[model samples]
Target: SHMQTKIQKYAGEAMPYPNRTDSMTPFYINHLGRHGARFPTSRKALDKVEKVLVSAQQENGLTSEGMALLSMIRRLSRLFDGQWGKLSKLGETEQEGIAGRMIRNYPQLFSNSAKIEAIATYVPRSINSMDAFLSCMIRHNPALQVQRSEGKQYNHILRFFDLNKSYVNYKEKGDWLPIYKAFVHKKISPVPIMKKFLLNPEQYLDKEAEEFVMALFSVAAILPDTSIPLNLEDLFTLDEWHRYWQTQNLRQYMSKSSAPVGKMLPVAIAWPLLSEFIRSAQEVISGKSDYQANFRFAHAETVIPFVSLMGIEKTDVQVCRPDSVSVYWKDYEISPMAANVQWLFYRDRDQRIWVKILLNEEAAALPISTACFPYYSWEKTRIFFNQRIEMAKKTLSVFN
Candidate 1:
């Protein structure tokens, strides 16, 4: 149950936006969102575990506890039977809820004649998420017109980091494993609880058992609806669950945040996407576009790095050690499933444009120099991003 709490912490549930009292109302919304919770992308892990359990059952070596666990696994596996890697029903509902909140927060932005432009990554899940969000908007405002586009044409902009070879190589060859292994060893080792479920616990090393437990926790993390009732708590103690949760948190920080190898790499890879947001908003500011909103659907891979680039929270940490626990870099807080960063543009009566940022639907303070706490002149924000683009170029070149 403690492990489940940790998973929920980073699951990126949709939230309500805070009230804004500024006289300037929202005229446009530029959004970047991650796909919602999903089934495991592949069946290999599920198959492997099932094979081991079945072999043990054949030998009549399974205990009562083992049988119960096996039953739960089979039930959970069926949920993903043909839907592996796809958005679950809960995921679609999440997207719809986010869209509904968006319209409610800024009704003026979505009118009968509003022109909304949206894009998604090439992946079917991303496209589906985009559709889910759009469905809600249309339902709220029946006469709303939306211009939607997807595929590789926008990949360079929406999915740049996902396609970058240098970034991929860095992630593959990075020295995060030793640190991760050490942390896991300290927190989640021994596996006494896990051993109770195994017919031949002695046959597997401590590391192997830890890996298996981690896999189970991963599945538990995205159970879609709690109503399905996969009570993993039966297999592990509360302390063990806390350790398991910490291990997951450490992995996310090292791989995606400003930890040693993660320093600036995420931000560098996200340059094109960041640039697109600035440029698109600039076009609107200059009266060259009529779109009221620009919505993008991608993955956590896209959202995290972009958040790093924006310096939204703890992402600005220059160096994070293995033991580092960022108050702001928590995966649940930053890039949980369906996580998003939004730029709400408002123009004053004097024709001055100001921008406010929203992270996961709540107002977020700009990490850069701003004219106010939650608002920055679009000009100032553009300059900050332009500098970021140049820095990203240099950083990417170094990686190459």
Candidate 2:
């Protein structure tokens, strides 16, 4: 019967039996028809035609989807009949094309009515050639594959088509749950299974079938079910989600601040040196330096470490107060104490100070390792400074 149609379409005359050689195979002839041009019935001519079509499609900006659909049509057309031209005569009403067959045979698989409508809208009423149809479909549905995430796994769109095919054909598949469990290799939750079956289909089978059911279940789950009402109070609110985010942000900030550096240092030496420097900075003005004063002043020296000196021979100076006062101190000198014992303590006899200063510098030079270190530190500094402004914010105090 298909042979009769082939003869009428291609040979220009109806024959009782089709001549296979005279009727170019469906793939080869349909391949020609896809371009809307006839081939000269020579291998060389066919190849030349193919190259021209490929080049033209590329130039026309035909997407991969269009090309893939064309490829599928060219390949599958042979399954119907070897006579390629017969495909063109198959009549669009028969649902012989890939998309046509998908929608007609497996209606349940199409949960996204919008997507189906979009594909249908693009199909030409009279597709003279496969390429024209393919080009249209490609422009409309570029993403041939659709897989929605379910927990850690996803279901492919093709699987849905297969499942729906099985369903409509009355294939034995356990109702949705067992089918889904078998597919995902997990125990099917009874609630979801019962809910889905009530909502979508009564049966499911194999992995593909289960996934198709799941996709439909997904759509149904989003819509409000009058038979089964949802508790609005139980649903998570945006404000609650925002609070959770804030909590996470706070934890992350704290973790980053307290996180350890990848590189280890001599904390014993560094900690004490920094402590002494911070301790020594405060002045009694007339009394000997106390522990608190010493600690504050010492930080100026302890900021750098001994390791930072590069060599034991490397030298630097420490500032010192002058003992005597003079006319320069009273009138012109940078300070009235300029004539006093203004001294530059070097690393020789003052090795302790040099080492302390080098340690402080080394600590300052250590590269911060956390991503949020700079930003966190800036925020911390703002907090510290803000507390100091007019005592607006209380500084964290330790009392003995």
Candidate 3:
């Protein structure tokens, strides 16, 4: 009764729709205002909500809705104080706090409502620890941020390779020895360490094994002093143990790689992806591709480029619609115009190529998730597109 009453008091009328109309808020914004709203049934909605929240946290200042939601989370933690799951759940809170901090610190990312929402949701409540973890994780991790001043181009080129080490070992051997071995061998040579350990592990074990066991410790002991040269002749070895630790990481993250791209991509990549998609879509409309694009866009390098084009210098993320893709910011709303034109590229189950034109301008009128774009399954994407198409055509046709 108390929960029901609470729901009624806060969520009631928070959303209102006439029976004849289909007015809906962005999924993440709506859910961020309410706790425990999930979407196992609608994967697209779930994915989109996640993206929007991550983006939001990476850009926008903390929303009242987010603050309220987090406040409730703190209260909820009291309900199960000292529970075993508390640590895991507390980890989530930390993540949210970190996301909020990232966004608050970077204002440009909030330009895209969906991205803002994604960061907001992506951040955990107790992010104080998360920040420390990220710092350690990314300190010498080279793949996250390129040293452009030093002409470093492919910061994430080896990300896949690095991540693959953990996956194969975990999949084949249940024992963590392979993973541990990979971690040790990454930055350090197995030959020297093995030789030293064989001679006297009791004496060398503390220096060798300890360095191998923990990446941070190894980095401190043997990290390269100068910047890693980025030219073709130079090897991207920041630490000797980096190559070995590569074994412990997993490609499990690859399965949903597209999801993270929408959040983590810096400006360099984001713009090109969006531009390419738009260009391809237009080409398809002119009969470049055979049919409508059935695949989702995977803009691995689109984040940076997208942010750069958005006229922002220091944001966590940025997404801009084509002028044709009209949006209503806080005040001024623009009308739809023709985008430069492009097609969307997608992959099939068999990895076949598919292309679709950017014809769904109707959907642009709807509000983007304040955090990130919502994920839509085949059925859901179709339903949403059709519904929005009909509404936009009907309303705009009548008004104009």
Candidate 4:
């Protein structure tokens, strides 16, 4: 379970959802997706570790294992030169798989002449991710029509975190800083892994020791995504990884989620996206749109907070402190790579549209009035969502 948070691999599953009750016809799908797993978004750690190894090489202090690791770091660092944050082949396959599953799950929605409009963040991963998903949809149904576009114009709704100053302040100036420091000071000694990788104890361990271990951890974290047959993770014990993950998880929880330590702006930053989602759905329900499907691709930062903003079950829970983060909100379970929140609109004979939410393709619940587990009254759900967005706006004002 802890490992899943670290890898954050695609979490979509084969588990089937309950059948729609009585008389219900699924019509439109509103999707918010994270880009699939890729290389680390930043290569700083890799480069930093490489510099340490190169300096060690000149002194001839590396053990046999250290020598091997040095080459691996060198090759790995250069591999990222023009490739930072680009999705891996495994990632492309993951996206394609999701699209195929969507086709099978909603066959009526993807038939020929199907109208699909998709947009993604300007980032390469988001754009390519949109491509992979749409590619499979088009492949599965040769007759579907797709409209593809991407850029900053969409960022206000798709990537709001970057644009909101209130959130930036919460992240850089919040009380979570002291909490994070305390957790680090609680220490999961990187000594074991550090010694295993380097022979001389005094050579470089005295300074930047934690960063060094984290750099190695970052490498191991992406190995699985790259399809490289490496168990670099073998060097560190599970406890070691968990320790590092705890601190990182706390940062995610406090900075990107609605936690007790900070203002609601973390999750509130996603209000725009939530508003757009509701607006689009309302348009469809109100007969303003004939579009069959809509897809919005973005980063985990966008998806994570949005879930909380919508009060989607587990993700919506609030924690009082950083230590309690893992107990409630595991990053992987919340919004792992390629994570998504799928809102399916089902219309019954009476023309009442019921809504169901799917997190990573499995049915999820909302904190609104719902007689059934997954099926919610769109009327009530929309009101709940609108109020939450208003609450977030109030949060923003409070911060301002």
Please tell me which predicted candidate would have the highest TM-score against the true structure: 4
- Displacement of residue 384 (Cα, Å) in model 3 is 15
Please give the lDDT score at residue 90 for candidate 2. Answer: 26
TM-score (C-alpha) between model 3 and the true structure:
0.20
Per-candidate TM-score against the hidden true structure: 0.89, 0.13, 0.20, 0.91
Cα deviation at 175, candidate 3, in Å, is 6.6
Worst 10 residues of 2 by lDDT: 23-32
Q: Across residues 228-281, which tens digit of lDDT does each residue of candidate 4 receive?
A: 555466666667777777777777777788777776778888898998999888
| Clash number by candidate, in order | 1, 38, 93, 0
* lDDT (C-alpha, whole model) for all candidates: 0.73, 0.22, 0.26, 0.78
Tens-digit lDDT track of model 3 for 84-185:
111233233332333343334333322232221111112121122234323432332323331111111212221121223332333345333443444334
Q: Residues 42-160, candidate 1: write the lDDT tens digits.
A: 77766666666777788876778878778877877786687877876666877887888788878888977899988998888889989999999998998888899888898787777
**Which tens-of-lDDT digit does each residue in 194-298 have in candidate 2?**
232222223323453334333322222221211122211112233322222222222221111111110112111222222222222212211243111010111
Q: If the candidates were sorted by their lDDT against the true structure, best first, what order would they fall in?
A: 4, 1, 3, 2
lDDT measured at residue 292 in model 2 versus the true structure, 0 to 100: 10
- Quote the positional error of residue 35 for candidate 1 in Å: 1.4
Model 1 RMSD, rounded to 1 decimal: 3.5
* Error of model 2, residue 313, in angstroms: 44
